[PDB]
């Protein structure tokens, strides 16, 4: 049968999302997070297969939902979460590449700000440079959580690209020269939306591939990296 749609992309009823949300690109990973780390969990969205869930982590309300790939996709889901669902804090949890000579596969990267080759932020600031900037309380909560768990982290800039299959000569060299630590596809679209709503966002990623040396984490290594990163993010939500 037909269900009421609070947004064109989300079947959750208003109020069905907690004020704090973790988001990852893969909806199947959102389900894994819910099934393994949330209690009191219920599925709240199924539209487009973009699974979302709401429950608790250590008693505190927490939701987790997929965001798909790229800035336009996360922008739809995050705009709706902040606007319609009255979410206050989103932490993107993801994987990334790196070009930095001192960042290695399996490293955990906490993002302070994100560059991009998208136009979406120029369009928000009269064509000027608008830094997609993580909220400091969120960054700090991630840093402090990792410290308490004795998990080392890299803290610094990400670069969110519209083009996974890059053909762009000189890009990697410039990213490395300025010590961008993470290359991914979404965080630069998230932070300005949080700003618009007077809300908060951050991002944490694990390095799956070194773009320069060609090193790549195995499936088991990616699972271990994910377990470290997700525990950092979950513990951080208790501070937010």
């Amino acid at each position: 049968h037909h269900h009421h749609m609070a947004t064109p992309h989300n079947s959750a009823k208003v109020g069905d999302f907690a004020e704090t949300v973790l988001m990852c690109g893969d909806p199947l990973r959102a389900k894994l997070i819910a099934d393994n780390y949330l209690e009191n969990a219920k599925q709240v969205n199924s539209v487009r297969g973009m699974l979302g869930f709401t429950g608790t982590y250590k008693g505190k309300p927490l939701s987790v939902m997929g965001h798909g790939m790229g800035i336009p996709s996360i922008s739809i889901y995050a705009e709706e979460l902040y606007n319609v669902y009255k979410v206050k804090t989103i932490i993107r949890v993801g994987t990334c590449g790196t070009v930095d000579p001192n960042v290695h596969v399996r490293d955990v990267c906490i993002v302070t700000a994100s560059g991009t080759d998208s136009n979406v932020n120029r369009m928000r600031l009269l064509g000027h440079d608008f830094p997609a900037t993580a909220n400091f309380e969120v960054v700090s909560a991630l840093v402090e959580s990792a410290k308490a768990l004795n998990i080392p982290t890299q803290v610094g800039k990400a670069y969110s690209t519209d083009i996974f299959y890059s053909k762009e000569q000189g890009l990697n060299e410039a990213l490395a020269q300025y010590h961008f630590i993470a290359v991914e596809m979404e965080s630069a679209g998230l932070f300005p939306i949080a700003d618009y709503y007077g809300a908060r966002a951050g991002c944490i990623c694990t390095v799956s591939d070194h773009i320069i040396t060609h090193e790549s984490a195995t499936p088991e290594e990616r699972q271990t990296s994910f377990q470290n990163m997700i525990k950092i993010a979950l513990e951080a939500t208790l501070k937010l």
Copy 2:
């Protein structure tokens, strides 16, 4: 268990896609298309929930797969289809809004070229204007199929935006002044990738909403529009 991954985003084995592929944003709609219009069908991808299927339509090999929302998402899937899976023709089948005073909800729009607010095409052509242009044989096959089915069509330009939740003053007025017939989020990313691979692409969409008058198709009207559009696209594949 773990399966071999021919790409990071697709579990299909090389050869598991037909040379002709229909793509829509919603993977659940890809499943509906497969279940109702394909024979000899098998599911060939499940990664990220982005369902894809291969079978036949009236005996001719045909695949259907979801592409997600926005240019970066379709770019990943389409690049892989043309490159790794050796696809020759992709037709995007979707829904759209319109601003044009003479285009109405439920109309079928066949896209000849697509504008965009993305930077991805400037990056391919030394910063210049690169029109995302549908292949003429594909456009013609869609037009002729609709004529044979006695289904009226609008033929003309689309506009692919990175931002579903537009805040941009004057955009709708400019799109209307120049008679853009469809507003959507992906086609401008598809056509240049087809060009790169010496392959073909097109797009057909049904109008779900009039952005100016605020008219909106009901669920049943959207189903009827989808049935008209999908039959046009399927019959067109027989010519391609």
Copy 3:
């Protein structure tokens, strides 16, 4: 003596242009077309030497006029034709270069859309990518006319440059990679003006030079190519 000027650039009286117009860059070629293919012909413009003529082709009203070289020049003449002279359809008939490895000197190219290094289309669409797109009925009429005449054609993208004497490294390689078939100087300015007026435009060109291999048509070869192209265009006007 002094004559009334309906525009600053055209001495034709309102009504002196047919609803369908062929335009070429060289006004002396416009005169050749009129003298050899039109009946009932009269010269209707002489301002700036930009000869224009109105008569009939196989009984149907048809005009032919020069447009000069480059986007700003065609923009003046075409804006006036659509606005003041109430023209409905303009077909640009021209010559072009090519970089595509499978397009050859003397080939006839029918343009579906045109890229450019001009800013004129960004200025029309809030700085975004606005594809200069030929009207589908015009493209189809050209394609079908060539088929009936048994003249092979290439159908695809043109690139309209402001700079005949290019010094731009990498441009030809990018145009070839994305299979632009024609390099010329005007069509990208024509199509958006037709859009503004709710009117129609297209373009057909013959390849005079291969920019990569350095092949070049002789004067006699250019005359033969012109005869093929002009017959296609004239027959197409009967369908428009």
Copy 4:
């Protein structure tokens, strides 16, 4: 019969142009200049109707040729003149509009530099601002010639637009605020080409229309303005 073509656009033999050339948009005006002010005159180009002539003014070699409308057109002709024909000095002689509150119809404007909405100069200077700048000796020769003839002049910036039929809100107000004295379509393309060849250029125009007040010179007033301007330019060539 067929004649040798030193360029694709000019039938003049190498050496047939003097080192100093006046250019105006209208080839019929080039003929008027030759017929009324040059001695020893011969027509040296007829291609595309773009008449050009070479003779003497007060015994000194001088050529005059049309350049057509817009930056791409003047760029073709001027590039060829400096490169193939070894011209040293080009003075553009034209008409213009004005928005400046203290510039009036029939005023003579001597151009020191020209702004533009074209991309051609960004493409020459790595995307940066490259001022299209008149040569100082040329500007000074025009100023001093007008002084000797007791003809008042305005000296300052022009703006060269690609779009005669402007739809651009706020442009006139900005041009007026910064005291641009002349609005025309070509000079910004001429000066950088002179620079490339280590050569010289300038521009002088008469105001035919006040864009703000709507005043417009009659045909007779335009003839008188032209006579003043052309005498200034001709006398200036004796100093160059």
Copy 5:
């Protein structure tokens, strides 16, 4: 007499700067800081009046130097400090305006990242968006120092403009919508230079003026704000 110049703009000998440097725009304020907060102090630069000093704060080496007004000025001085003088950490200490409805005159703002209307960061990252991002350890040291001193702070984005005397409609509204807390002229040029050198930077400012409400701190209020901010910065250097 003439002294050796290690850079064109700085008479300090290599080694004469500490590894940690505070910089403010006004060199006379650099002198005030040195005279009132440093021990073991010596003047190390006088070129262009851009006073710089080196001494200790609570025993730890610390320098303080003026940077002048605007991105190009700070870029010269900071590039030299990181490159020639082997500085590791620069904290910019300044004043700012605000547009944010919840930021007030006399507030202390700690900058996490800075937007800009300059092109300098696009030029470093292939024309893309490169966020000028403060180092997290520096931000944290400033935050923790203010907490220990019981001084409230605002933490968030700055905007560095090239134009003190703005005429730009809509800028303040956009800055407020996205909750930029500080409007100043230099920090966006500092952070990318620190990145290039593998070094660290941050910025702290006091609000002298509310751009919207027109409130303005008196000289005495500015002195009190400066005393709070400088103590935070000095204590932070002990952690860096």
Copy 6:
């Protein structure tokens, strides 16, 4: 004690500046100019160490003040001079590099217009190319003064960069190809401000360094070049 501030950056009382002002980057050089060439001199500004002075040169009122380094710095000081202090004419007197093969160290360069990599002029002219253009009477006064003093000059374009420490491949080659004679950091910001106020500006510089050949003037050679340039500028003020 506290003094009244007519601007945030200048302690001069309204009326304390002459209508004609020389400006140089280094305030200590402004003091040298005042002390050695002005009579009736008084210091009128000390804020930020940006020394300014007013007196007479050969009996005519003249001021001299530092402007600091870069477009944003000169923009502050010059905007205030034209607006608050009612200055009519500013001549920037400076040093520069050159890339031109025929310009040599110690040459005096008189600037007719200035290119830039700044965005400040695009922001004034709706994103278009706005040439920073010197006033012709000022240029002419400088040229004629140098002639009377028998000092050779180069007259032509400058390029004002935001980045002293360039890392930009191909920039020098392009500047040389188009015969830019002076590379400096401020003049492109000055001329448009003079335009806004209906006032006049110019620039004269001496070549301290050849960027290509690596030649560099010694301190004594720079003093001699400065003496030549300053005498030209001072004599020019008598004509303005």
